[PDB]
RNA sequence: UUGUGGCAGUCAAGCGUUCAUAGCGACAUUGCUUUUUGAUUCUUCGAUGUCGGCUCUUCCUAUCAUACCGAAGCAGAAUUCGGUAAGCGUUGGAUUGUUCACCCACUAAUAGGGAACGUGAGCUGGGUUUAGACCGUCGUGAGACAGGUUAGUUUUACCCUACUGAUGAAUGUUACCGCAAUAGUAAUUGAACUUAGUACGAGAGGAACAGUUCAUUCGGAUAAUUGGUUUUUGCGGCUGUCUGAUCAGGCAUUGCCGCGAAGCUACCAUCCGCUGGAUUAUGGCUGAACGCCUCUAAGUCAGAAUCCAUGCUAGAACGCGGUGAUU
RNA sequence: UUAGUGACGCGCAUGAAUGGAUUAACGAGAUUCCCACUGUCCCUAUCUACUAUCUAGCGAAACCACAGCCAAGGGAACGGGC
RNA sequence: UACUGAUAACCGCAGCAGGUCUCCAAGGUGAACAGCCUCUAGUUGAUAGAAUAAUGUAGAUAAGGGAAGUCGGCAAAAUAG
């Protein structure tokens, strides 16, 4: 995160590498999000940068609105589909992996969210909490 | 010509040579720094790694998010019956190092420890230490003066102790034997303390206490001759590759026309001496006690031994230790515990720990029940339960 | 702490032991074991599975 | 050898609001390097396997970043110049055979180079580099073209050395406990909250040390949990067929499916990753020469990712000690 | 996006049976992109049979001045020897 | 005018996984002298024994992502009646 890190983050098992397409949850016009980068990413050789839950990323739209399409944009993950482990040891995973468009500071360009999200993202990105229906 | 794209040294070279140890009992290289203001006491201990398990407690670091919330943590369990003190040796210092000038043993010994002296015990006269006992069998005939020699000399003293492998559930009957440094009080006091403690048990309630950070010293599990790919963390070469991909491709340049030591190479993995540190103790517990597995919050009377036992070990009917996290060494194995060398405060070594629940479920599967009472309760009776 | 109930087997889930699943409709399921998890992904009926508490209580066993 | 390529100096007309030197520095000039490209032809034509990438280590520093510092046309932030410094790190992709280049994006930063233009009994064989074939141009023609395209066998280590691991005679024997020469060594960087919207700044904007929680990279272990694996050929089921039918079983190159313990294993999981001294640069104390003055000349303080120790790894198989029993 | 495609054409050196321009279908032809799929890959792990391994028995070959520890030096300018 | 007619009688330096013309051709599954099992007939030959380290050969599976790999989706998967 960095800029819009309202506090810190605990590591989350990583399942969304570059090349990953993930759903878009919000009301911004999009259908999918092609990850291409990650903020705070590590720099190792022939290692793919992997996103997580809460990790802001740069993404593209391969499917959706022609105002959003053919340009990068910051985006944030809310769902992972990869079993990670909270400090209470609960191994949990969604069925899908999705995210939402944003500005660099973290405020969703979209005004709502369609489905559940992660409590980590909800605690780290307050605007997502604002536009959240359900959290976990 | 240079490396096109940079990347770091695969592996760590301080931990070389990667070779089989000299023993199944890791040498304690270094003890703490002796001080006199404190009382005479041990600075190490011996047990046997039994296995791992999982617990629950309430974290307290003021500024986390799980501050004052529950967590769950992997712990490691050691069976630590009280060690029998027999003997002490005296180390005088030289420009060539510390050096033993005397090793004083005790009169009476156990079959286990003199078995450790022997190899083929079943065909033996069991002739050992008899003339030592006959140097005993008098007031002080040839012992008092060795002790006073150690007093006059010997800046350092190390007490010889041995374990109770017959108190363990193991099948060895051959005791383990070792030395420990004492880091308390004066030298005369150390030696007379040890003289008092000849042939005597010493226990973990005396050596350690909860929320103490320690070092675990042991030999790490053997994995045989192994390739570079698991032994070092090297990139698997690609699919199309004649003559092997679980390899290193280049092992050095033309000049120097030699294989550099730093290059990776296949060979022994495991059975390695390792000394891990900063392992907070979470519970001392007692063999001669039940409810070892029961916290103040649970209060369900139950020991630590799970249903069907520890896998490859059995029970914990002796005094035992539960420490945070992993340690070097596999099940059924010796382990050498040690006080730290440095007063690490850090708001991590001082975090006071009180427990809530302890998984006493079967590790020989995916155990749903911590207790057969609970099991029968959930299930109802059974065909076998007439 | 607390203990919970597998959606499938209906079994106590002591802390950490087992998996959790969060469907898109925000239904939070818990599974003591990959057995239950895999059956769930197969879309099986525990009322038909015999060793399950639902079958047990639907056939009136241990009453 | 070093023209040329690259790098660094001397001098200072000028630029820089004013002022040659904060920073740049034309005209002129002295050097260095061999990572270019030439020049030469000493070795090599009874053959040193020939571009690049991949992999992987190590080295230099002319330091991109990080540690500490000095200078500024440095208010603060940001930036520039310079010193000790090569300890530590220097990416993922698009197109191209590519070196190189150019873009995208993250980044603390995405510095340059060497090791027979490192590395083919280590790979690959895109390219180049035989034979087939197509085009263009040249040629009367056979045929030519660092012009373009396509297709085109990449052999052997069982020897010595080096390397990793592993044994081992001989020391009066045998067993146990130890020492510790020497060698190796490792931990790295960032973010967030707070300090503080404070300092500073007319305003615009906008810090820092300490403290806390977290993460990146690397490492060393471990397998409680989760995941994977499943010849437990453990349980159940499924197809075809054979055993008169059933029960129970064979064959199906482990027949197939679902579950699946144990063991192995994963930044796909977890745990851990030390503190003291001497020092550099730099700033200084007293202090003369030079009756002043000056960090220096004698002496002397603090001071870094440095260096050495603590610690960690192996233990000299011709380094040693203590102890027990010794037919 | 030095690729791919569509256009432009003072085309170093396009071009008409030295055949030109298209062209359905066909192609183990060359090439680009999209869907699916995937251990190619992030990043490796695990399992099986046959090997290697040890044994009994059998039992070659290539190659070989002599042999087989490094550094620098100079030297046929890159030594195992000096 | 016997016999073989070929993973030992032929040619391949040989008791070489190669090559060498043809006739007969059961039952079930199933579109099928496919593949798989069986009957008659024929074989039980190929150095064997012990363990199961690496590296291999041949076969397979792998969470999340999905060609980011690479000269290039090569190989493998997925689809399949």
XYZ file of N, CA, C and O in Angstrom, chain B residues 14-138:
500
model
N 28.595 -19.504 5.971
C 28.933 -19.717 7.358
C 28.573 -21.093 7.864
O 29.266 -21.626 8.733
N 27.512 -21.683 7.333
C 27.046 -22.994 7.740
C 27.715 -24.112 6.974
O 27.158 -25.210 6.889
N 28.863 -23.861 6.424
C 29.640 -24.884 5.770
C 30.751 -25.358 6.681
O 31.172 -24.637 7.587
N 31.266 -26.573 6.468
C 30.852 -27.625 5.542
C 29.552 -28.306 5.901
O 29.295 -28.564 7.069
N 28.743 -28.605 4.890
C 27.482 -29.310 5.092
C 27.790 -30.794 5.138
O 27.715 -31.512 4.140
N 28.131 -31.258 6.329
C 28.580 -32.615 6.526
C 27.911 -33.211 7.746
O 27.355 -32.507 8.587
N 27.963 -34.532 7.814
C 27.435 -35.232 8.961
C 28.199 -34.811 10.197
O 29.415 -34.614 10.163
N 27.470 -34.662 11.289
C 28.050 -34.246 12.542
C 29.021 -35.292 13.071
O 29.161 -36.393 12.536
N 29.694 -34.924 14.157
C 30.568 -35.843 14.866
C 29.824 -36.694 15.877
O 30.444 -37.538 16.528
N 28.525 -36.486 16.041
C 27.802 -37.143 17.113
C 26.319 -36.882 16.936
O 25.905 -35.981 16.207
N 25.529 -37.686 17.638
C 24.085 -37.525 17.703
C 23.709 -36.586 18.845
O 22.534 -36.473 19.206
N 24.696 -35.897 19.413
C 24.493 -35.024 20.559
C 25.319 -33.779 20.310
O 26.545 -33.808 20.429
N 24.642 -32.696 19.972
C 25.326 -31.503 19.514
C 26.164 -30.908 20.627
O 25.703 -30.756 21.761
N 27.402 -30.581 20.295
C 28.279 -29.913 21.234
C 27.733 -28.534 21.545
O 27.275 -27.814 20.654
N 27.778 -28.169 22.819
C 27.490 -26.811 23.243
C 28.802 -26.044 23.155
O 29.693 -26.211 23.985
N 28.919 -25.195 22.138
C 30.159 -24.470 21.932
C 30.402 -23.498 23.067
O 31.509 -23.416 23.610
N 29.365 -22.764 23.442
C 29.505 -21.572 24.252
C 28.372 -21.475 25.247
O 27.203 -21.629 24.888
N 28.733 -21.228 26.489
C 27.815 -20.911 27.558
C 27.804 -19.415 27.819
O 28.601 -18.665 27.248
N 26.918 -18.943 28.682
C 26.894 -17.515 28.996
C 28.107 -17.018 29.746
O 29.070 -17.756 29.968
N 28.050 -15.755 30.145
C 29.147 -15.112 30.844
C 28.969 -15.250 32.346
O 27.993 -14.751 32.913
N 29.917 -15.941 32.974
C 29.901 -16.167 34.409
C 29.811 -14.850 35.168
O 30.433 -13.847 34.814
N 29.006 -14.868 36.225
C 28.892 -13.741 37.138
C 28.724 -14.293 38.543
O 28.176 -15.384 38.722
N 29.186 -13.533 39.533
C 29.345 -14.018 40.896
C 28.233 -13.543 41.817
O 27.913 -14.216 42.802
N 27.649 -12.396 41.521
C 26.576 -11.842 42.332
C 25.386 -12.774 42.451
O 24.688 -12.749 43.466
N 25.141 -13.603 41.441
C 24.030 -14.516 41.474
C 24.403 -15.770 42.251
O 25.559 -15.957 42.629
N 23.443 -16.654 42.504
C 23.776 -17.949 43.091
C 24.253 -18.935 42.044
O 23.940 -18.835 40.858
N 25.007 -19.917 42.529
C 25.408 -21.043 41.701
C 24.170 -21.716 41.140
O 23.226 -22.032 41.872
N 24.173 -21.944 39.833
C 23.097 -22.682 39.199
C 23.531 -23.065 37.798
O 24.496 -22.522 37.255
N 22.799 -24.009 37.222
C 23.095 -24.462 35.882
C 22.804 -23.362 34.868
O 22.222 -22.320 35.179
N 23.234 -23.613 33.633
C 22.989 -22.722 32.510
C 22.582 -23.484 31.263
O 22.676 -22.940 30.158
N 22.123 -24.715 31.412
C 21.785 -25.563 30.286
C 20.945 -26.710 30.813
O 20.692 -26.816 32.014
N 20.510 -27.569 29.907
C 19.709 -28.718 30.288
C 19.629 -29.658 29.102
O 19.992 -29.308 27.977
N 19.135 -30.854 29.376
C 19.001 -31.909 28.395
C 17.629 -32.535 28.506
O 17.115 -32.747 29.606
N 17.047 -32.829 27.355
C 15.803 -33.546 27.302
C 15.757 -34.360 26.040
O 16.787 -34.750 25.492
N 14.541 -34.621 25.589
C 14.321 -35.364 24.358
C 13.136 -34.742 23.643
O 12.060 -34.601 24.230
N 13.348 -34.326 22.401
C 12.271 -33.779 21.600
C 11.189 -34.815 21.416
O 11.450 -35.912 20.922
N 9.972 -34.458 21.795
C 8.837 -35.350 21.682
C 7.990 -35.062 20.465
O 7.707 -35.966 19.680
N 7.580 -33.816 20.294
C 6.876 -33.427 19.100
C 6.323 -32.031 19.259
O 6.657 -31.312 20.200
N 5.468 -31.674 18.316
C 4.821 -30.380 18.289
C 3.356 -30.513 18.655
O 2.803 -31.610 18.759
N 2.743 -29.360 18.848
C 1.320 -29.239 19.071
C 0.968 -27.768 18.920
O 1.789 -26.961 18.473
N -0.253 -27.416 19.288
C -0.809 -26.115 18.969
C -1.651 -25.641 20.137
O -2.318 -26.438 20.800
N -1.609 -24.336 20.388
C -2.173 -23.746 21.588
C -2.943 -22.485 21.222
O -3.082 -22.132 20.053
N -3.439 -21.804 22.248
C -4.144 -20.541 22.101
C -3.737 -19.634 23.247
O -3.595 -20.084 24.387
N -3.565 -18.354 22.950
C -3.283 -17.384 23.991
C -3.657 -15.999 23.499
O -3.964 -15.793 22.325
N -3.595 -15.049 24.422
C -4.009 -13.674 24.193
C -2.753 -12.834 24.039
O -1.997 -12.652 24.998
N -2.526 -12.333 22.834
C -1.343 -11.536 22.584
C -1.434 -10.211 23.333
O -2.515 -9.726 23.671
N -0.265 -9.631 23.605
C -0.199 -8.300 24.201
C 1.073 -7.623 23.694
O 2.149 -7.787 24.272
N 0.931 -6.867 22.612
C 1.951 -5.921 22.163
C 1.213 -4.622 21.852
O 0.474 -4.562 20.848
N 1.367 -3.560 22.655
C 0.482 -2.402 22.488
C 0.733 -1.614 21.216
O 1.570 -0.709 21.160
N 0.003 -1.989 20.175
C 0.088 -1.323 18.894
C -0.175 -2.234 17.720
O -0.289 -1.767 16.583
N -0.274 -3.530 17.974
C -0.765 -4.448 16.972
C -2.281 -4.366 16.886
O -2.939 -3.645 17.639
N -2.830 -5.131 15.953
C -4.268 -5.246 15.790
C -4.830 -6.428 16.549
O -5.961 -6.360 17.038
N -4.059 -7.504 16.656
C -4.359 -8.605 17.551
C -3.909 -8.338 18.980
O -3.847 -9.270 19.788
N -3.584 -7.091 19.305
C -3.391 -6.701 20.689
C -4.639 -7.022 21.494
O -5.738 -6.571 21.163
N -4.465 -7.822 22.542
C -5.568 -8.231 23.407
C -6.598 -9.046 22.635
O -7.803 -8.934 22.863
N -6.117 -9.867 21.713
C -6.946 -10.788 20.962
C -6.272 -12.145 20.944
O -5.092 -12.284 21.278
N -7.031 -13.154 20.548
C -6.503 -14.501 20.549
C -5.634 -14.741 19.334
O -5.771 -14.093 18.295
N -4.724 -15.690 19.490
C -3.920 -16.208 18.407
C -3.847 -17.710 18.593
O -4.424 -18.278 19.519
N -3.121 -18.346 17.694
C -2.866 -19.770 17.766
C -1.473 -19.994 17.215
O -1.100 -19.428 16.183
N -0.708 -20.827 17.908
C 0.731 -20.859 17.769
C 1.207 -22.293 17.808
O 0.711 -23.112 18.583
N 2.175 -22.583 16.960
C 2.810 -23.879 16.945
C 3.908 -23.898 17.986
O 4.796 -23.042 17.974
N 3.837 -24.869 18.886
C 4.828 -25.042 19.929
C 5.489 -26.389 19.738
O 5.020 -27.244 18.986
N 6.583 -26.566 20.454
C 7.373 -27.775 20.418
C 7.580 -28.236 21.846
O 7.793 -27.420 22.753
N 7.499 -29.547 22.032
C 7.449 -30.160 23.345
C 8.702 -30.992 23.546
O 9.128 -31.728 22.646
N 9.267 -30.893 24.741
C 10.436 -31.662 25.127
C 10.135 -32.369 26.432
O 9.536 -31.786 27.340
N 10.571 -33.613 26.524
C 10.454 -34.404 27.731
C 11.757 -34.262 28.493
O 12.825 -34.586 27.966
N 11.667 -33.741 29.712
C 12.829 -33.286 30.471
C 12.796 -33.877 31.867
O 12.594 -33.162 32.853
N 12.981 -35.187 31.990
C 13.147 -35.764 33.306
C 14.379 -35.186 33.976
O 15.327 -34.759 33.293
N 14.406 -35.149 35.303
C 15.512 -34.463 35.967
C 16.806 -35.222 35.772
O 16.856 -36.447 35.884
N 17.845 -34.484 35.468
C 19.128 -35.068 35.124
C 19.889 -35.390 36.390
O 19.875 -34.627 37.360
N 20.569 -36.524 36.368
C 21.351 -36.989 37.498
C 22.727 -36.359 37.374
O 23.474 -36.650 36.439
N 23.033 -35.461 38.298
C 24.363 -34.918 38.478
C 25.253 -36.003 39.034
O 24.946 -36.588 40.088
N 26.351 -36.254 38.317
C 27.476 -37.059 38.760
C 28.743 -36.409 38.226
O 28.990 -36.392 37.017
N 29.525 -35.819 39.114
C 30.859 -35.400 38.761
C 30.967 -33.968 38.312
O 29.978 -33.324 37.964
N 32.193 -33.472 38.305
C 32.512 -32.157 37.774
C 33.967 -32.173 37.350
O 34.776 -32.921 37.904
N 34.295 -31.346 36.366
C 35.667 -31.178 35.924
C 36.032 -29.710 36.013
O 35.177 -28.816 36.015
N 37.336 -29.486 36.048
C 37.895 -28.176 36.275
C 38.756 -27.721 35.129
O 39.658 -28.436 34.682
N 38.464 -26.520 34.649
C 39.115 -25.937 33.495
C 39.949 -24.752 33.942
O 39.413 -23.753 34.451
N 41.252 -24.895 33.775
C 42.200 -23.822 33.942
C 42.463 -23.234 32.570
O 42.409 -23.925 31.553
N 42.799 -21.955 32.541
C 42.944 -21.227 31.295
C 44.413 -21.058 30.951
O 45.257 -20.864 31.830
N 44.705 -21.135 29.659
C 46.047 -21.017 29.131
C 46.004 -20.133 27.901
O 44.921 -19.887 27.357
N 47.152 -19.683 27.394
C 47.168 -19.059 26.067
C 46.779 -20.013 24.965
O 46.470 -19.563 23.857
N 46.798 -21.314 25.240
C 46.324 -22.347 24.342
C 44.888 -22.755 24.631
O 44.431 -23.775 24.108
N 44.182 -22.009 25.474
C 42.770 -22.228 25.705
C 42.489 -22.790 27.075
O 43.375 -22.995 27.906
N 41.206 -22.989 27.323
C 40.813 -23.701 28.514
C 41.269 -25.145 28.395
O 41.443 -25.683 27.301
N 41.487 -25.766 29.545
C 42.087 -27.086 29.588
C 41.651 -27.753 30.870
O 41.745 -27.154 31.946
N 41.206 -28.991 30.752
C 40.810 -29.749 31.918
C 42.051 -30.232 32.633
O 42.953 -30.791 32.002
N 42.101 -30.005 33.941
C 43.146 -30.587 34.769
C 42.647 -31.745 35.608
O 43.453 -32.595 35.997
N 41.353 -31.801 35.894
C 40.795 -32.856 36.712
C 39.353 -33.107 36.323
O 38.608 -32.179 35.993
N 38.979 -34.381 36.386
C 37.602 -34.832 36.261
C 37.325 -35.704 37.467
O 37.890 -36.794 37.588
N 36.480 -35.216 38.361
C 36.087 -35.932 39.559
C 34.712 -36.498 39.280
O 33.803 -35.763 38.881
N 34.566 -37.798 39.455
C 33.286 -38.462 39.344
C 32.754 -38.747 40.736
O 33.357 -38.390 41.748
N 31.613 -39.412 40.774
C 30.977 -39.833 42.006
C 31.267 -41.302 42.269
O 31.815 -42.020 41.433
N 30.880 -41.748 43.460
C 31.113 -43.130 43.846
C 30.221 -44.066 43.055
O 30.704 -44.939 42.326
N 28.919 -43.890 43.189
C 27.940 -44.815 42.653
C 27.401 -44.299 41.330
O 27.249 -43.094 41.127
N 27.165 -45.230 40.415
C 26.753 -44.910 39.062
C 25.587 -45.807 38.696
O 25.351 -46.839 39.327
N 24.865 -45.399 37.664
C 23.751 -46.175 37.161
C 24.165 -46.988 35.946
O 25.091 -46.630 35.201
N 23.454 -48.101 35.760
C 23.723 -48.992 34.642
C 23.649 -48.241 33.328
O 24.434 -48.494 32.419
N 22.738 -47.280 33.234
C 22.580 -46.503 32.012
C 23.847 -45.728 31.663
O 24.308 -45.747 30.514
N 24.453 -45.067 32.640
C 25.592 -44.224 32.307
C 26.840 -45.068 32.071
O 27.600 -44.828 31.120
N 27.073 -46.092 32.891
C 28.229 -46.910 32.544
C 27.977 -47.746 31.288
O 28.932 -48.116 30.593
N 26.722 -47.970 30.916
C 26.440 -48.489 29.592
C 26.909 -47.517 28.534
O 27.469 -47.927 27.516
N 26.707 -46.226 28.770
C 27.197 -45.252 27.808
C 28.703 -45.292 27.713
O 29.264 -44.959 26.666
N 29.369 -45.685 28.788
C 30.796 -45.952 28.669
C 31.075 -47.164 27.801
O 32.071 -47.174 27.072
N 30.233 -48.184 27.883
C 30.433 -49.428 27.150
C 29.775 -49.374 25.776
O 29.055 -48.436 25.436
N 30.078 -50.391 24.968
C 29.345 -50.680 23.743
C 28.639 -52.021 23.792
O 27.411 -52.077 23.650
N 29.384 -53.103 23.987
C 28.819 -54.439 24.127
C 28.734 -54.729 25.616
O 29.662 -55.247 26.233
N 27.589 -54.390 26.178
C 27.334 -54.473 27.601
C 26.803 -55.831 28.007
O 27.070 -56.286 29.122
N 26.065 -56.489 27.120
C 25.468 -57.769 27.451
C 26.506 -58.855 27.651
O 26.212 -59.858 28.306
N 27.701 -58.688 27.095
C 28.828 -59.575 27.361
C 29.918 -58.689 27.921
O 30.782 -58.183 27.210
N 29.857 -58.482 29.221
C 30.843 -57.645 29.864
C 30.884 -57.998 31.332
O 29.883 -58.406 31.922
N 32.067 -57.835 31.907
C 32.239 -57.950 33.340
C 31.626 -56.775 34.089
O 31.556 -56.819 35.321
N 31.187 -55.733 33.378
C 30.685 -54.503 33.977
C 31.721 -53.880 34.907
O 31.389 -53.233 35.901
N 32.990 -54.058 34.569
C 34.086 -53.517 35.356
C 34.297 -52.080 34.925
O 34.911 -51.811 33.894
N 33.748 -51.153 35.695
C 34.003 -49.744 35.470
C 33.789 -49.000 36.772
O 32.856 -49.298 37.519
N 34.668 -48.044 37.043
C 34.607 -47.180 38.215
C 34.695 -47.940 39.531
O 34.451 -47.359 40.593
N 35.067 -49.217 39.502
C 35.148 -49.983 40.736
C 36.299 -49.487 41.595
O 36.146 -49.250 42.799
N 37.459 -49.295 40.981
C 38.585 -48.755 41.716
C 38.383 -47.285 42.037
O 38.999 -46.776 42.975
N 37.492 -46.603 41.323
C 37.093 -45.270 41.750
C 36.273 -45.331 43.033
O 36.496 -44.545 43.958
N 35.325 -46.264 43.115
C 34.574 -46.448 44.350
C 35.473 -46.876 45.503
O 35.167 -46.584 46.672
N 36.556 -47.587 45.191
C 37.540 -47.993 46.181
C 38.505 -46.875 46.548
O 39.110 -46.923 47.623
N 38.675 -45.888 45.672
C 39.261 -44.616 46.072
C 38.308 -43.872 46.984
O 38.729 -43.134 47.881
N 37.021 -44.072 46.749
C 35.959 -43.862 47.718
C 36.004 -45.071 48.649
O 37.040 -45.729 48.748
N 34.941 -45.322 49.407
C 34.914 -46.338 50.460
C 35.794 -45.952 51.647
O 35.967 -46.749 52.575
N 36.361 -44.743 51.627
C 37.106 -44.180 52.737
C 36.529 -42.790 52.947
O 35.550 -42.423 52.290
